[PDB]
């Protein structure tokens, strides 16, 4: 129940991710500064879309805007819908979830650096923010949880804040 975007984003150990900034553009790195995703608005003067690119520059997911849909790769086609996020703080519904138990939830506070992501059907914690151009926090993604999925949530939280 940890795979959302792609099983290749599910590591057997915890991974801590963080935001590095130079505005919707920034990078998400591991603890050691290794790039995991570049986050950007793909089109100038349009602010409704962000893409997460891997280190090779390949789109991993596209987020499109209190309601976001997140699509596979560089798509915004409905057939490529992975999940919808609705604004305790955020509820996530996988693309095949036609109803309204959410599949994941985010609670806690962005500004306190205390966000926690839970799996809906067990309420298991899948990721946890901790307070520390580096933002003052990291997010632990637990083993076998999809870290591209968690990185997309971090992107949405940042959007809500800005």
Look at residues 127, 130, 99 and name the one whose alpha carbon lies nearest to residue 113: 130
Q: What's the resolution in A? A: 1.7
Answer whether 3's CB lies under 8 Å from 20's CB. no
Contacts 24+ apart (CB under 8 A), 69-78: 70/152, 72/5, 74/42, 76/49
**Technique used to solve these coordinates:** X-ray
Number of structural domains, the chain?
1
What CA–CA distance (Å, rounded) separates 8 from 28?
17
CB atoms within 10 A of CB 141: 28
Distances (CA, A) of 140 to 81, 120, 151: 26, 18, 11
Q: Report the CATH number at residue 110.
A: 2.40.160.200
Residues spanned by the domain of 123: 1-162
List, in order, residues 6 or more apart from 57 with CB less than 8 Å away. Answer: 38
Answer whether 35's CB lies under 8 Å from 18's CB. no
- DSSP secondary structure of the chain: ---SS-GGGB-SS-EEEEEE-----EEEEETTS-EEEEEE-SSTT--SEEEEE-TTS-EEEEEE--EEEEEETT---GGGEEEEEE---EEEEETT------SEEEES-TTTT--EEEETTT--EEEEEEE--B-SEEEEEPTTSBHHHHHHHHHHHHHHH-
What CA–CA distance (Å, rounded) separates 114 from 158?
13
List, in order, residues 6 or more apart from 20 with CB less than 8 Å away. Answer: 26, 27, 28, 29, 33, 133, 134, 135
Look at residues 97, 143, 142 and name the one whose alpha carbon lies nearest to residue 120: 97
């Amino acid at each position: 129940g940890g795979v959302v975007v792609d099983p290749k984003y599910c590591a057997p150990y915890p991974i801590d991710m963080a935001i590095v900034r130079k505005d919707g553009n920034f990078v998400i790195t591991d603890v050691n500064g290794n790039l995991l995703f570049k986050v950007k608005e793909p089109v100038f003067g349009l602010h409704d879309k962000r893409v997460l690119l891997d280190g090779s520059g390949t789109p991993v997911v596209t987020l499109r805007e209190d309601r976001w849909q997140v699509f596979r790769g560089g798509s915004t086609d409905q057939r490529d819908l992975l999940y919808t996020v609705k604004r305790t703080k955020l509820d996530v519904f996988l693309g095949h979830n036609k109803d309204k138990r959410c599949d994941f939830r985010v609670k806690g506070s962005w500004l306190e650096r205390s966000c926690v992501v839970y799996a809906g059907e067990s309420d298991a914690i899948v990721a946890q923010m901790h307070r520390k151009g580096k933002d003052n926090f990291s997010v632990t993604v637990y083993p076998n949880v999809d870290y591209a999925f968690i990185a997309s949530l971090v992107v949405i939280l940042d959007d809500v804040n800005r």
